[PDB]
Amino acid sequence: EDKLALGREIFLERSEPQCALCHTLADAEAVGEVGPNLDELKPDAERVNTAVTNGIGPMPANEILTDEEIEAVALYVSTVAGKAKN
Amino acid sequence: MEEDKLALGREIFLERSEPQCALCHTLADAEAVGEVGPNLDELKPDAERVNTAVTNGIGPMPANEILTDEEIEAVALYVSTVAGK
Amino acid sequence: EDKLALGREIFLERSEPQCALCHTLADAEAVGEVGPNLDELKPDAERVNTAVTNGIGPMPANEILTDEEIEAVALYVSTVAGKAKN
Amino acid sequence: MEEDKLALGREIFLERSEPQCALCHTLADAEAVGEVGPNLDELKPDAERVNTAVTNGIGPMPANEILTDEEIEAVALYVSTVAGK
Ligand code: HEC
Ligand code: HEC
Ligand code: HEC
Ligand code: HEC
């Protein structure tokens, strides 16, 4: 509910650069084309958290998000991938 | 197709759908230029093929939650009518 | 000069749907991804005019542009393809 | 790289260039998410490789007209410094 609104906001607004600009994710109405479609990947929380934290390939590692924000966007993505809002 | 049903189908394809079909798909009639999904002017699906994709989802396309059945029938008819013109 | 401003405006604003939404063309700062990069294709005036007039593949045929507007966007594209503004 | 030269390189990559490099290219440092051209965080070009592309154009990438040589050197240094971080 509220932990979802948070991840959504990180995915769309707080992240730098924003996840939504690089990634596709229907729940967020995000259609970024730079990296993989997250509705296709359907990653678990750990996989997201690791990717955001360390970076991977040409994806940059996080600098501005706190650890709890990284967890919240990891939880969010892993829960909503493949599905639309509510 | 009567002008009011076409107007209905356009509104669903462009705005009512969640996410909006036009966010992901191209369809010249609606001036939709989505890229993530297939170009519907290329696909030229029939009404049943559209109805099934929207109702059930397909691959990374999400299943509909917001539209009613009548609204799904409406957009299916719309897309199958105008795709490729 | 003025015949170029015209083609540019047709390419960006007057066309329905707009050429710029489907096509990439540097002079217009257009980065549409639906059809081919026109800076890559570098078509002659005839090839553009025919495509706009008749449509081709999933590209729709024109309905709203007058014949002189079709000529102007054909002239424009064929002159500027591969190059940036002035 | 001093903060003012980085600020210069960002401004050129994002706004001064014509068209804007960020319109076509991805570069995380600039929050650029262009798709038409290659991802520069993947390419990780050196300064000479950037200078040559911008000066001469390459494939469907147009040659620079607007930037001065100093401005081309600046953006080349910028991209080669930050590409991949
Ligand atoms: C471009 C400037 C991006 C930013 C902003 C975000 N992501 Fe990303 N991501 C991007 C690329 C090019 C890749 C592919 C990496 C590779 O070379 O394989 C990714 C990858 C991911 C993944 C999958 C990682 C894996 O284990 O395979 C995930 C789950 C992911 N990215 C999520 C994600 C999040 C939550 C972002 C906001 C903090 C984010 N990405 C931003 C490109 C870019
Ligand atoms: C991104 C979040 C999408 C939205 C929103 C809509 N569609 Fe979609 N669609 C999308 C993808 C990635 C695909 C490919 C599916 C696959 O893996 O093959 C599709 C596909 C379709 C199709 C073709 C289905 C088939 O039988 O092959 C149709 C007819 C279609 N989509 C229609 C459609 C409608 C009506 C939408 C709004 C209700 C809509 N799509 C939204 C991506 C996305
Ligand atoms: C999508 C909704 C588009 C609109 C709007 C415009 N174009 Fe297009 N164009 C599009 C596609 C998908 C294609 C490929 C056709 C194929 O199947 O091969 C094209 C093609 C062209 C071409 C090349 C034609 C050829 O001879 O190979 C040109 C020169 C071209 N289009 C120009 C053009 C102009 C001027 C437009 C505005 C009036 C325009 N296109 C709009 C997709 C779409
Ligand atoms: C679209 C109109 C572009 C703009 C604006 C810029 N670039 Fe670009 N770039 C573009 C394409 C399609 C390509 C691929 C070229 C090819 O055919 O291989 C490129 C390539 C580059 C490269 C790599 C060059 C190489 O040696 O392979 C670099 C380093 C590069 N571009 C940098 C760059 C800069 C600094 C820009 C602003 C001055 C810029 N590009 C704009 C497309 C477009």
Residue of B nearest to A27 (CA): B19
Amino acid letter at B81?
A: T
Rounded to whole angstroms, how far apart are CA atoms A67 and A71?
6
Task: Assess C34–D contact: CB distance below 8 Å, yes or no.
Answer: no
Cβ contacts of residue C28 below 8 Å, gap of 6+?
C8, C11, C12, C20, C80
**Nearest-CA neighbor of D12 among D81, D84, D80, D76?**
D76
Of D31, D35, D41, the CB nearest to A58: D41
B64 touches C at CB < 8 Å: no
Resolution in A: 2.2
Q: Which domain holds residue B26?
A: 1-85
Query: Do the beta carbons of residue A28 and residue A49 sit within 8 Å?
Result: no
Name D15's Cβ contacts closer than 8 Å, sequence gap at least 6. Answer: none
Q: In this structure, what CATH number is given to the domain that contains residue B67?
A: 1.10.760.10
**How far, in Å, CA of C54 to CA of A38, rounded?**
38
Contact C18, C28 (CB under 8 A): no
Residue C40 contacts D, CB cutoff 8 Å = yes
- Which chain A residues have a beta carbon less than 8 Å from that of B33? none
Alpha-carbon torsion (D75, A22, C32, C9), positive or negative: negative
Q: Which residue in A72, A79, A80, A86 sits closest to A25, CA to CA?
A: A80
Output the six-digit token pair for A43. 């990653």
What is the C-alpha R_g of chain C? 11
SS (H, E, C) chain D: CCHHHHHHHHHHHHHHCCCCHHHHCEEHHHCEECCCCCCHHHHCCCHHHHHHHHHHCECCECCCCCCCHHHHHHHHHHHHHHCCC
At how many degrees (to 10) do helices B3-11 and B69-82 cross? 110
Way it was determined: X-ray
Pick the closest to residue B31 from B47, B13, B46 (CA basis): B13
Dihedral angle over CA of C25, D77, D16, A12, nearest 10: 80
Q: What are phi and psi of B30, to 5 degrees?
A: -85, 0
How many separate domains does chain A show?
Answer: 1
Q: Angle at Cα B14 formed by Cα B59 and Cα A14, nearest 5°? A: 70
What phi and psi, each to the nearest 5 degrees, are found at residue D79? -55, -45
Residue bearing tokens 């007057």: C14
Are the C-beta atoms of residues B19 and B73 closer than 8 Å to each other? no
CA angle in degrees (0–180, nearest 5) for D50-D55-D56: 105
**Nearest-CB residue to C31 (from D23, D64, D65):** D23
